[PDB]
Amino acid sequence: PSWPQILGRLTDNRDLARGQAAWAMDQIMTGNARPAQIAAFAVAMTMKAPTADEVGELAGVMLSHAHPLPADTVPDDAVDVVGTGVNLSTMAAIVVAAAGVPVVKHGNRAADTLEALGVRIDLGPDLVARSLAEVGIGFCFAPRFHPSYRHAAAVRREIGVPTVFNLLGPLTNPARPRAGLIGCAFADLAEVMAGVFAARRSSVLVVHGDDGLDELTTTTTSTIWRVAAGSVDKLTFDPAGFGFARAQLDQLQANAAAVRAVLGGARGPVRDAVVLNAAGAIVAHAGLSEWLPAWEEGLRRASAAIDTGAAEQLLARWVRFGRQI
Amino acid sequence: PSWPQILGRLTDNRDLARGQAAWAMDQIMTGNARPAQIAAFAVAMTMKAPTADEVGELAGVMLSHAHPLPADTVPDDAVDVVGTGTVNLSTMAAIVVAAAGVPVVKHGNRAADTLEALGVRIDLGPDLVARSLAEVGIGFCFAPRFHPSYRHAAAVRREIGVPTVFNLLGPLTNPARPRAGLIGCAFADLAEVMAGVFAARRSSVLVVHGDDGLDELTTTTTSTIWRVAAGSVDKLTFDPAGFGFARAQLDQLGDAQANAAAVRAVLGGARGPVRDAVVLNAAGAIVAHAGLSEWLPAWEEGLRRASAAIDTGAAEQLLARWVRFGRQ
Ligand SMILES: O=C(O)c1ccccc1Nc1ccc(OCCCCP(=O)(O)O)cc1C(=O)O
Numbered sequence: 001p002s003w004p005q006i007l008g009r010l011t012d013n014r015d016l017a018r019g020q021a022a023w024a025m026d027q028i029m030t031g032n033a034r035p036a037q038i039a040a041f042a043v044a045m046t047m048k049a050p051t052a053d054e055v056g057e058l059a060g061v062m063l064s065h066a067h068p069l070p071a072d073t074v075p076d077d078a079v080d081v082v083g084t085g086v087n088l089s090t091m092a093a094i095v096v097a098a099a100g101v102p103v104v105k106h107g108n109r110a111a112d113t114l115e116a117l118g119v120r121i122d123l124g125p126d127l128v129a130r131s132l133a134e135v136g137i138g139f140c141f142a143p144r145f146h147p148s149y150r151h152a153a154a155v156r157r158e159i160g161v162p163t164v165f166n167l168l169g170p171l172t173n174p175a176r177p178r179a180g181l182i183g184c185a186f187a188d189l190a191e192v193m194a195g196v197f198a199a200r201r202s203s204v205l206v207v208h209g210d211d212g213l214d215e216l217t218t219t220t221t222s223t224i225w226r227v228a229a230g231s232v233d234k235l236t237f238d239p240a241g242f243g244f245a246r247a248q249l250d251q252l253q254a255n256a257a258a259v260r261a262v263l264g265g266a267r268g269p270v271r272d273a274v275v276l277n278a279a280g281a282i283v284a285h286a287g288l289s290e291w292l293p294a295w296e297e298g299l300r301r302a303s304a305a306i307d308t309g310a311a312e313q314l315l316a317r318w319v320r321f322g323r324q325i
Numbered sequence: 326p327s328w329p330q331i332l333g334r335l336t337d338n339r340d341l342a343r344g345q346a347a348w349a350m351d352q353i354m355t356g357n358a359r360p361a362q363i364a365a366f367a368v369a370m371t372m373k374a375p376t377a378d379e380v381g382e383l384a385g386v387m388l389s390h391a392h393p394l395p396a397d398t399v400p401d402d403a404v405d406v407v408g409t410g411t412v413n414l415s416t417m418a419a420i421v422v423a424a425a426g427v428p429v430v431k432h433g434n435r436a437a438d439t440l441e442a443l444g445v446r447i448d449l450g451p452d453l454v455a456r457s458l459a460e461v462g463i464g465f466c467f468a469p470r471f472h473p474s475y476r477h478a479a480a481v482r483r484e485i486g487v488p489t490v491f492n493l494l495g496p497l498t499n500p501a502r503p504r505a506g507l508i509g510c511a512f513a514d515l516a517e518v519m520a521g522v523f524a525a526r527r528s529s530v531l532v533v534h535g536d537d538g539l540d541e542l543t544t545t546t547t548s549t550i551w552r553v554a555a556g557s558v559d560k561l562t563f564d565p566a567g568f569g570f571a572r573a574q575l576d577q578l579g580d581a582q583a584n585a586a587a588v589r590a591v592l593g594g595a596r597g598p599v600r601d602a603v604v605l606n607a608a609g610a611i612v613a614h615a616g617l618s619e620w621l622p623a624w625e626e627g628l629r630r631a632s633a634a635i636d637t638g639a640a641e642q643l644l645a646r647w648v649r650f651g652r653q
């Protein structure tokens with residue numbers, strides 16, 4: 001295999017042969033790729049239109065190089081709550097964890113929201129494991145678990161344009177949770193991302209707000225690719241069906257204040273959006289083992305996690321956990 | 326403008342707005358583009374099939390930055406003989422055309438190697454290329470010497486390896502700006518684009534693509550010719566069998582050392598498929614030359630002039646004189 005071979009195939013608008021995407025990603029992560037080669041690959045794959053097989057190979061290589069969490073430290077039913085791209089997902093994650101569903105998130109700075117809240121984001125595998133056990137939630141700092149991806153990440157920022165690489169974050173949570181609510185801002189790639197989760201037998205709702213959000217929106221309908229039993233089912237979701245009023249898009253350090261307000265019981269469109277996304281994660285969680293009863297239960301659990309103060313308390317306990325390390 | 330804007334537009338499979346390709350090329354040519362940005366643009370512009378307007382803007386920026394030849398040193402009827410990539414055929418055809426009395430000014434880069442092997446000094450500044458054109462009847466613009474700020478793009482092209490839109494610009498960024506030529510293109514889809522760019526400049530060009538894939542007029546089969554003249558483009562099918570040329574095989578048409586030997590053989594009068602191809606392509610450039618000011622009569626004359634340039638020894642002498650020039 002070679003870069004001219006692989007780049008040539010892509011520029012010819014052909015799908016890659018089995019293993020080729022993997023070879024490319026492994027070159028990129030073993031420091032064997034020039035920035036120009038990385039950029040050419042990211043762009044060419046994007047314009048060719050990536051397959052789930054291809055994106056799967058990319059994510060597979062990344063996870064093969066990643067620092068794992070220690071053995072038997074991630075519950076079988078842990079979930080992620082995240083988008084391709086953060087205020088809504090951070091809150092939803094806390095609420096989901098507070099409802100009793102273990103959450104392990106994965107991210108990087110532009111993570112900023114959590115720091116502003118007093119959470120310690122840069123922990124190693126053993127301490128993330130302890131956080132997950134003792135608090136019910138953990139955060140994997142992406143640079144710390146994916147050191148070899150730094151070359152790729154640098155090129156991402158240099159070219160600016162979105163590419164297939166924008167999918168890899170949610171697909172390479174180093175804790176490897178089997179479930180989640182996953183936002184995707186790119187309607188065409190959402191389906192591909194869903195296929196990758198399907199191949200892994202994950203239980204995920206891949207969500208794309210029809211207003212463009214990488215979260216379940218309250219301003220209008222959302223497209224959901226429901227992934228369960230290795231298959232993908234495409235659905236349109238209307239929050240009005242669960243009694244939610246339509247919000248305006250503009251209503252959705254600043255984030256930290258917003259987090260404190262919602263967890264404190266503030267009513268409004270932000271809370272509604274948090275509750276909706278938290279419920280989505282809980283439905284995805286239920287999928288590891290009916291759509292309407294599942295959503296109704298998810299919504300009850302999410303609302304109760306806030307209203308009882310459990311979500312607010314969990315964040316406080318999370319903050320305290322880090323200050324005691 | 327900005328890279329996110331232009332690259333986003335290209336990845337969305339949209340043609341660029343007026344000026345955007347120019348802006349991009351200019352960033353690249355002023356050392357203001359990161360290698361990753363250069364590469365992303367090269368690939369995106371390639372996979373979003375480039376338009377004549379866009380390719381014209383790229384070449385235009387390149388020429389706006391290039392060292393020109395001194396005023397009035399390039400004859401109004403000078404021609405180019407070149408392919409996008411057959412360096413053996415175009416090199417020989419170029420010498421033959423010059424020997425027939427049509428000024429030739431070429432533009433090229435090392436992978437030029439064949440000419441050096443023949444003892445020609447290829448790396449000359451504008452003033453000496455001009456002198457070469459006047460005194461010998463042929464000149465060569467060595468690309469790094471005229472396009473110095475292209476070096477960042479050059480490095481990126483080596484790194485990614487695959488052909489891109491940048492592979493199309495060579496015939497369109499000749500710093501001597503000849504107004505006529507025989508221009509080969511290996512990709513038929515882009516040949517029509519190249520013809521469009523030449524038409525915009527009102528060049529008299531034959532853009533040629535062998536139906537066997539050669540970036541020359543072939544003798545193995547027919548060729549497609551985009552005939553550019555009067556700012557308008559006519560697309561034609563061309564069969565050299567109509568001029569009595571025997572069919573050759575693709576294998577009959579090497580490194581710079583071998584190419585030089587082949588050059589010496591042809592200019593020395595060796596008959597065969599290689600000579601035929603040279604004569605045919607030399608004739609084509611002569612036909613393009615005539616178009617600056619009737620199709621079959623033009624070809625018949627072009628073929629007579631090319632054959633005679635070889636057979637009298639004029640072509641062989643011109644090369645000897647070209648080599649002599651560099652040493653004096
Ligand atoms: O930004 C991304 O696209 C990304 C996606 C998945 C995982 C990580 C990502 N980013 C990075 C990964 C590594 C990295 O660089 C690692 C530095 C850590 C050094 P050490 O080996 O000592 O832990 C930087 C980034 C980044 O976003 O800037």
Ligand SMILES: O=C(O)c1ccccc1Nc1ccc(OCCCCP(=O)(O)O)cc1C(=O)O
Pocket residue numbers: 433434468469470472473474475476477479480491492494495496
């Ligand atoms: O490669 C370098 O980094 C370099 C360094 C110093 C001086 C020249 C350099 N390279 C070039 C600079 C300009 C240039 O200009 C080429 C323009 C024409 C391209 P084409 O013949 O393919 O149409 C080509 C090169 C090169 O190394 O290839």
